[PDB]
Each structure stands twice: as C-alpha cells, then as structure tokens.
C-alpha cells in the first residue's frame, strides 16, 4: 500500500479494527521506510482515540485534544481534516507528506471532501501515496454490512415529534439506546418528552460534541439523542439504535440563497454507519437497530460538494494547476475547476470569515467574492425583507458596532446561520463586530 502513485480503500466492515489494529501497523512500516506520513482524524474525539492505539509510537499530535510533549523526531503528523484544510488554505507551508492516511473517510463535511480531492489528485501525478480508511466508500449501496455479532434489523415507524401513545417499544426497554434525528430542534422535542417519562438522555451535535459526548463515558444514561456527527467514529456502550433514517439538506436556490431542505432520506453509507453503532460486540449478540425510512443517494445536489469546489479552487497545488475531486464522488456537482478561484485579497478575506468568523463555505464566498473586507458588517443588514432573519416568530433584532439598534436582514441569505438558538445566536455576535 505504502508504494508511491498509489490509492488504497481499506473498506473492512464496522467494527472491524481499522483504528485500533490496521493503523499502528501502517504506521510502524512508514516509519521503517522514512515516510513522512499524515494521519487524518474526522474529530478531536478520534484523535484521542487514535493517541490509545498509537501510545509509544513517536506521533506529533497537531491537536489540543491530546496533552503530549513532543520530542521534536517525529516524521508523523496527526490532525483533524479540517485542520489539513484550514493549513492548506492560510499562507503556512505545508509538508508534501509521502503518505497520506484518512480515518473515515465517508465524512461528508466541506473541508473532507476537499482533503480527499488534494490528496487523491497527488496520488494521480504520481507525487503520494494515500490510504482512506471506511466501512462505507464513496458509492456504497449496502446500509446493512457485516459486524462483529448478529443484528436484529426492524422496519418500524419511529417518532419524530413527542407522544403520547402508540410506542410502548421505545420507552418498554432496559437497555440503553443511541437515537440518531434529523436535527438538533427534532432531537430537543424528543429529549424533552423522553426526560418527561424518567429518561436520563444526553444530547450531541456538531458543536457541543467533545464536552457532551464525556457525559456518555462518566455517567449512567437510557439514551443518546444525536445528529449525524456521530456516524464519524463515535463509539458507545449501546445495546439499540433507533434511526429516524432522515437527515437536513443544505441546497442552493438560483445561485442566491442556501435553505435546509427535507428532513429527507439518508444515503446507504450514513444508514451503514448509523446502524454500526451496535453489534460491535462479539460476545453481545441480538443488538437492535429499529430504522424508520428507506435510503436514497440525497448526496447529489447537496451543497457540500459545491462548497468543497470553492475550497479546492482557493488551494496552491502547482502553477495554474486546481486539485479535482476524489473520482467517485466527483459527480455529486455541475462545476467547473477554477470558477471560485479568488485573487489573493479577496481569498484572504475569504479564509478569515471561515476561520475566524465561523461562516459556512459558501456564505464566506459571496461575501468575500464581492469585494468585501472581513470587517465591514454592512452586508449583514442591507438585504431584501425577505432575508429578514426571525426569532421566535419575530424579527431578530442587534445592536450594530455603531450603536444602532437594526433587524438583521444578511444581504446573502444562509439558513445555517440560524438552524437553531446556538447557530442564531453566534451569528447576532458576527453580525454586531463582536469577533
């Protein structure tokens, strides 16, 4: 594998050992052969995971999540896939590892799928050799793989709202349930009627993922209330998985506006991961996994590989040369190489508002294509009325840099600066000059 010009999928099924077995392997023969090797962990919660497998093993850990002195003779380097991204991006040199190695690879966030297309196109001019490491490749149509015992797979209707009758099953059980949901709003109004019948449940999504998902190691809990993040490595000591099979869809309208459509099917590979979660115990067979929806391909069309492209166009790989897609999940968009290509000023202003101001790929764009400076805040009021961003069904109001009390009215709409308290909340701040 570890030969250059050469890409390897290690697809074993869930549970299998791709972490905790295959990768301090892969990394005892790299460092034999003196390749200066990358490894690549979806979150800081698998980073730390990774450091247990590769205890002894001299590892430069690029991560606050693990307190390690580093003796300064390390040709490994481990970071998250967006911190890869983020340093290809930002001016800091960075090395032209001999190999590349990607722990779960399926990650479907922006700044993955760019990983994947940089380090597969210099797999392609013969520079690297690369390693993706996932039960569920690009294009996989299987949602039930194997695992380490036998699963009980159940069809069944599964809420999405609070009841009051009509699903003795989930609340009749004295196991302890991982409950995957469409979105952080969906999973509060379960969790609250959850708590409301004398469940200990505890909440995780995208933001609050490394503080809450502790709570899941160091205290009792009935059940787990998660997005998708935790298809990502997220390991528990779980006995069912009830999966709503749905998910959010960021889709761009005209070229103009970004809305949060569906919640729709998810794809084979989320179903796979959802669903891998359980069975992972040789010893434990007759796990659950209750699924309430059929899969659908929801990837294509999905602004996140839009997204990915405004990235890679902004990335140096060699002259005029710009990093293509990974091969088998490169037609999931109608775009043209180069086409988000930003002058230098313009792509500086760009990697700021994702950085430093926290905005999704593609707002960060228009506003930085527009000639605006990562300061100027005017934008975040002079749209149309129809951009005008509510707040428990009124319009959402901040008090300017200026001092000016104004309705917050983005002149580029995006419905991810406001899918929930948390998200509407950060943007008031970004909105107002606050970071």
Same mark, same amino acid.
């Given at each position: 594998m570890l030969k250059k010009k050469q890409l390897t999928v290690l697809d074993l099924h869930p549970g299998a050992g791709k972490t905790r077995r295959v990768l301090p392997e892969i990394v005892r023969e790299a460092i034999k052969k003196r390749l200066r090797t990358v490894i690549l962990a979806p979150?800081?919660?698998?980073?730390?995971?990774?450091?247990?497998?590769?205890?002894?093993?001299? &590892?430069?850990?690029?991560?606050?999540?693990?307190?390690?002195?580093?003796?300064?003779?390390?040709?490994?380097?481990?970071?998250?896939?967006?911190?890869?991204?983020?340093?290809?991006?930002?001016?800091?040199?960075?090395?032209?590892?001999?190999?590349?190695?990607?722990?779960?690879?399926?990650?479907?966030?922006?700044?993955?799928?760019?990983?994947?297309?940089?380090?597969?196109?210099?797999?392609?001019?013969?520079?690297?050799?690369?390693?993706?490491?996932?039960?569920?490749?690009?294009?996989?149509?299987?949602?039930?793989?194997?695992?380490?015992?036998?699963?009980?797979?159940?069809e069944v209707e599964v809420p999405e709202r609070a009841w009051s009758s009509g699903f003795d099953w989930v609340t009749d059980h004295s196991g302890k349930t991982v409950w995957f949901v469409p979105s952080v709003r969906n999973g509060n109004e379960i969790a609250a009627c959850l708590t409301k019948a004398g469940k200990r449940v505890i909440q995780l999504s995208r933001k609050t993922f490394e503080t809450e998902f502790q709570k899941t190691k160091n205290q009792e809990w009935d059940f787990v209330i998660t997005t998708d993040i935790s298809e990502m490595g997220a390991n528990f000591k779980a006995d069912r998985v009830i999966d709503s099979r749905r998910c959010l869809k960021p889709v761009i309208l005209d070229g103009e506006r970004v809305i949060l459509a569906g919640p729709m099917p998810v794809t084979h590979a989320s179903a796979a991961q959802r669903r891998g979660r359980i069975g992972r115990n040789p010893n434990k067979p007759g796990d659950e996994y209750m699924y309430g929806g059929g899969c659908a391909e929801t990837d294509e069309g999905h602004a996140h590989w839009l997204e990915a492209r405004m990235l890679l166009d902004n990335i140096y790989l060699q002259d005029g040369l710009i990093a293509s897609l990974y091969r088998p999940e490169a037609d999931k968009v109608a775009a043209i190489e180069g086409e988000f290509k930003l002058r230098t000023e313009q792509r500086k202003t760009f &990697?700021?508002?994702?950085?430093?101001?926290?905005?999704?790929?593609?707002?960060?764009?228009?506003?930085?294509?527009?000639?605006?400076?990562?300061?100027?805040?005017?934008?975040?009021?002079?749209?149309?009325?129809?951009?005008?961003?509510?707040?428990?069904?009124?319009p959402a109001e901040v008090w300017t840099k200026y001092g000016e009390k104004r309705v917050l009215k983005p002149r580029w709409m995006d419905a991810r600066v406001c899918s929930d308290h948390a998200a509407l909340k950060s943007f008031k701040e970004f909105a107002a000059g606050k970071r």
């Open positions: 979150t800081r919660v698998v980073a730390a995971e990774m450091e247990e497998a590769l205890r002894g093993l001299p &590892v430069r850990y690029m991560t606050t999540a693990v307190n390690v002195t580093h003796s300064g003779t390390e040709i490994v380097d481990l970071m998250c896939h967006a911190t890869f991204t983020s340093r290809l991006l930002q001016p800091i040199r960075v090395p032209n590892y001999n190999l590349n190695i990607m722990d779960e690879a399926h990650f479907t966030d922006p700044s993955s799928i760019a990983a994947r297309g940089y380090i597969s196109t210099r797999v392609e001019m013969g520079e690297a050799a690369a390693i993706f490491m996932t039960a569920t490749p690009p294009g996989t149509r299987d949602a039930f793989p194997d695992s380490n015992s036998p699963i009980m797979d159940t &990697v700021e508002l994702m950085k430093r101001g926290d905005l999704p790929v593609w707002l960060a764009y228009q506003v930085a294509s527009a000639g605006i400076t990562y300061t100027d805040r005017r934008w975040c009021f002079d749209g149309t009325t129809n951009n005008t961003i509510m707040e428990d069904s009124v």
